[PDB]
Design a protein around this ligand. Structure first.
Ligand SMILES: Nc1ncnc2c1ncn2[C@@H]1O[C@H](COP(=O)(O)OP(=O)(O)O)[C@@H](O)[C@H]1O
Length: 964
RNA sequence: AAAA
């Protein structure tokens, strides 16, 4: 805190006037900043550098009667003057309106446009919006291509790439190409696709970039400006319509703590006190939140969860409550009957729908990819119409069209599998929490996050409190990619690596990254600590002893040692694992808890036993039914010592035992009333009067008879480490607090410096380059290309495989080797099912009919993985083999034989929505392999893939829109 | 294992 300001907290009005000309501070505060910057095209010669200003007027010449705010004005104005523009703002900013102008601008003078979306499901929704608006619109997806000759086109990012590599003529006729949610280029699988598309695109194409808030937004335009020789504008705004307050919910905790104030203030104590809660360690705790926020009037509330599976469970436990009124009760199934006419009688009885119908009546929504496109769309409608006050959604919901709420809850702070157990990045936080805070009902937005972690916390602060993260290119080499680049003569695989956004980052980052280090080095040098050395050897050995004594009590707490010393009435010292002391006590009874009901994994023997122990603590009096946590929820005698002081038998876990007494107190059989328990307390108090310095402890060595070589070692390193603490200015003054507080930042920055040091190592990283030589060797060895590394016939059908990434070689190998021709069309379709999707499926079929072809295409993977691994790449022999799924082979095959859709989902646990997804994509692998056989010269396998394709196509499995 |  140096120079900063503070908004008016709750409600205020700053101005007033009378009768002629006022000054408007009216009903908005405080959302302020906007930004406009322009990237410029590089100059060819020294001889001439033109300096070209363009500052476009606020309100354009013709607004087409459309409604526009000051922000979207210059976004439109940039397109109006016909130049590329980047709009980076929250999904609340209304970015869609500028996309409709760009198309309308082109349609006005009658030329062609391409609209694109990260996701095909969202592409279809925007299509029917565009078609019903303009009418000259048509969509090309993989599955369905409708009206391709239309001026405006809605297509998958996958399709847009496939036409460029194949050099479609339609790209010569396209003026503008609109990319939406481009900040999702981060995706480790399909994010590389966005870069491949952009770089290869014609230089005369004008661009529109619709993105969330990103720090490097200007850096992105530089990269577009340099490779395309264009002037690319940047329109960026940080404003959001509603203030945001952040509450932390500790795991197992009984409440929420406010970490971030509405004005941005970060509470350190709430953060620290929250961490005290998590040392006390399937949580139903979400059912509690949704319960009270109904009564606290926080609605609607969007609960974000990153798994399809556990997402429905948190909806199930909350299904025991009903938040809807009778007028809302019958309104949801009155609007539910419209989609029945759009469905078949067999499909209207579908199992998924019969579950959700009573659920929506209770006012509980659910949104994810495992849902039917018609069913999830009604749920999307019902939310923004206000008939659903509680929604359990996945990350995809935050990517889609604006559908804001009053509350946003983060259930999990860790993120996905692909390369890392990855803490939640800042960009995802801004995007999801941006859903909170609608216009006129919210004084404030409410954001709740549950926090537990798997190594060390300092990260946990950095997510919300710290800075944002760079938008990192996920660009990486691929088999399908290197062949497509080696395919066209005009371009080499090295050409794309040059213009890839990852290279553009590193080149411009490193000279600046050098200044990042020297500025960091000044601060740690600018801090001057008296006796800079001795302290490093105090804090150094401070964390050394505090850590190694934890290893001593841990062995003692283990039943191997302490258990034999458990006797009724033995004096016991109880201190919670968090470090809070419940005071002394006396052992009443010890019992091992055996065989819990089901859910939680069986107990480790450290926490296994349960010790009933008499303590003088107080707090919420009841909890005799005791949570599996360490203790009933109490409060030690810091609290009300008047309202309660009672010696009470407390069922403490075994890890709460830090010491044992030397002698035991005689105990009766029953402590029930206050009399029976208070009498034992005086028996304890008597011991305290005779032992002022402390109560004698059983010596772990001699008294408890622990001779272990590992125990002796730890205990010997305990003694000598204690002696080092006395050799420092520990005694005769405790000023170490001021030293540690100043020295703490020195180590934080020092650790922060080492990262910036290793940051340069990753800027100069050769991973892309070294992979290419190693990857092109297996292309030569497997026979895909020659010794001169020139394309061969096999590589021409491998460039035709798109929809499937990673089996591109396997599929190319099997097809060229004359495999699918020895089979039947139904068999050909069920075999290609293994490649299409990686979601787990449970059914039991080892049936030898489909096991024979599966084992063969599986063995071929081992052949591929054999030479590819010793080529100095990294792939395991087992991992790649198992990347194909046999659990769905029975399922898809049944649909091809003309069995009803309803029975199909009864064979497996596959989502009815996910089943649609893997079919439509399987459908496209067929259409792509139809072209693959067409290049090979074998036209019998073309019809083979076409006759198979015809059996996956029917009336009700094709449902999007029917217009023109 | 989330998203296409
Ligand atoms: N000038 C404006 N100020 C505030 N809200 C607006 C404005 N224009 C549109 N909106 C509303 O804000 C929401 C965001 O619009 P939209 O463009 O659909 O979101 P996205 O940017 O995700 O496409 C819309 O529901 C719209 O009604």
């Amino acid at each position: 805190i140096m120079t900063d300001a503070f908004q008016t907290a709750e409600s205020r009005e700053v101005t007033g006037a009378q009768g002629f000309a006022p000054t408007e501070g009216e009903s908005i505060v405080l959302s302020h900043n906007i930004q406009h910057q322009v990237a410029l095209p590089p100059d060819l010669d020294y001889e001439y550098i033109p300096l070209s200003e363009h500052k476009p007027p606020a309100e354009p010449a013709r607004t087409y009667s459309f409604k526009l705010d000051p922000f979207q004005a210059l976004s439109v104005a940039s397109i109006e003057r016909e130049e590329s523009v980047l709009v980076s703002a929250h999904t609340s900013a209304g970015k869609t309106v500028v996309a409709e102008y760009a198309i309308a601008q082109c349609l006005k003078k009658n030329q062609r446009v391409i609209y694109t979306s990260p996701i095909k499901a969202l592409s279809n929704q925007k299509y029917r919006d565009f078609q019903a608006e303009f009418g000259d619109v048509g969509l090309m997806t993989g599955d369905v291509t409708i009206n391709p000759t239309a001026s405006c086109l809605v297509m998958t990012t996958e399709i847009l790439r496939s036409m460029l590599y194949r050099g479609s003529e339609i790209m010569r006729e396209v003026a503008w190409v609109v990319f939406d949610e481009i900040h999702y280029m981060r995706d480790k699988i399909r994010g590389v696709v966005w870069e491949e598309t952009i770089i290869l695109l014609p230089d005369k194409v004008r661009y529109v970039f619709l993105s969330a808030t990103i720090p490097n937004a200007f850096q992105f335009a530089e990269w577009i400006a340099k490779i395309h020789r264009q002037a690319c504008h940047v329109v960026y705004t940080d404003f959001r319509p509603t203030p945001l307050q952040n509450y932390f919910f500790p795991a197992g905790g009984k409440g929420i703590l406010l970490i971030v104030d509405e004005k941005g203030n970060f509470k350190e104590n709430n953060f620290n006190q929250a961490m005290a809660m998590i040392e006390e360690k399937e949580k139903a705790d979400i059912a509690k939140i949704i319960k009270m926020i109904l009564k606290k009037n926080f609605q609607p509330v969007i609960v974000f969860n990153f798994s399809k599976r556990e997402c429905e469970q948190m909806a199930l436990a909350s299904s025991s409550m009903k938040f809807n009124a009778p007028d809302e009760e019958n309104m949801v199934n009155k609007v539910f009957e419209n989609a029945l006419a759009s469905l078949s009688e067999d499909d209207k009885n579908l199992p998924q729908i019969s579950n959700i119908l009573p659920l929506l009546r209770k006012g509980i929504g659910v949104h994810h990819s495992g849902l039917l496109p018609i069913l999830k769309e009604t749920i999307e409608i019902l939310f923004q119409e206000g008939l659903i006050k509680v929604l359990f959604a996945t990350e995809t919901f935050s990517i889609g069209l604006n559908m804001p709420a009053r509350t946003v809850v983060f259930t999990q702070v860790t993120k996905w599998d692909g390369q890392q157990r990855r803490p939640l990045t800042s960009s995802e936080y801004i995007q999801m929490a941006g859903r909170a805070g609608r216009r006129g009902l919210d004084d404030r937005g409410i954001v709740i996050m549950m926090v537990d972690d798997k190594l060390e916390p300092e990260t946990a602060r950095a997510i919300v409190v710290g800075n944002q993260d760079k938008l990192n290119s996920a660009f990486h080499l691929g088999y399908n990619m290197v062949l497509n680049l080696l395919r066209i003569e005009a371009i080499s695989p090295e050409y794309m690596l040059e213009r890839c956004f990852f290279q553009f980052q590193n080149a411009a980052s490193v000279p600046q990254l050098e200044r990042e280090l020297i500025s960091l080095q000044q601060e740690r040098d600018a801090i001057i600590i008296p006796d800079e050395s001795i302290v490093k050897d105090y804090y150094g050995v401070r964390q050394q002893l505090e850590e190694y004594n934890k290893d001593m009590v841990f062995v003692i707490q283990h039943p191997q040692n302490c258990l034999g010393f458990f006797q009724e009435g033995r004096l016991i010292h109880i201190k919670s694992p968090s470090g809070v002391d419940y005071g002394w006590g006396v052992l009443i009874k010890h019992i091992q808890r055996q065989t819990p009901k089901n859910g939680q994994p069986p107990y480790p023997e450290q926490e296994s036993y349960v010790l009933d122990v008499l303590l003088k603590v107080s707090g919420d009096f009841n909890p005799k039914t005791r949570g599996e946590g360490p203790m009933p929820e109490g409060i030690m005698p810091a609290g009300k010592d008047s309202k309660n002081a009672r010696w009470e038998v407390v069922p403490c876990l075994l890890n709460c035992l830090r010491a044992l007494g030397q002698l035991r107190v005689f105990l009766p059989k029953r402590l029930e009333s206050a009399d029976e328990k208070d009498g034992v307390g005086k028996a304890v108090d008597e011991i305290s009067r005779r032992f002022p310095d402390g109560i004698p402890i059983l010596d772990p060595m001699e008294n408890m008879g622990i001779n272990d070589d590992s125990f002796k070692k730890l205990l010997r390193k305990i003694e000598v480490l204690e002696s080092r603490l006395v050799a420092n200015p520990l005694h005769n003054s405790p000023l170490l607090v001021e030293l540690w507080n100043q020295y703490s930042l020195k180590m934080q920055l020092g650790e922060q410096i080492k990262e910036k040091k290793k940051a340069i190592a990753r800027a100069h990283s050769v991973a892309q380059l070294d992979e290419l030589k190693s990857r092109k060797r297996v292309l030569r060895r497997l026979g895909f290309i020659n010794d001169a590394e020139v394309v061969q016939m096999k590589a021409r059908v491998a460039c035709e495989i798109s929809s499937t990434e990673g089996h591109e070689l396997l599929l190319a190998e099997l097809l060229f080797n004359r495999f699918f021709n020895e089979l039947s069309p139904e068999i050909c379709a069920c075999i290609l099912s293994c490649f299409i999707f990686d979601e787990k499926i449970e059914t039991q079929a080892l049936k030898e009919e489909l096991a024979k072809p599966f084992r063969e295409i599986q063995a071929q993977a081992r052949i591929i993985a054999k030479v590819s691994a010793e080529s100095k790449l990294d792939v395991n022999e087992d991992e790649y083999v198992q990347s194909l799924k046999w659990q769905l082979m029975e399922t898809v095959l049944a649909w091809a034989q003309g069995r009803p859709f309803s029975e199909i989902c009864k064979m497996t646990n596959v989502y009815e929505g996910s089943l649609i997804r893997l079919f439509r994509r399987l459908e496209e692998l067929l259409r792509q392999m139809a072209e693959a056989a067409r290049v090979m010269g074998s036209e019998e396998l073309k019809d083979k893939f076409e006759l198979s394709l015809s059996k996956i196509r029917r009336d009700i499995v094709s449902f999007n829109s029917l217009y023109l």
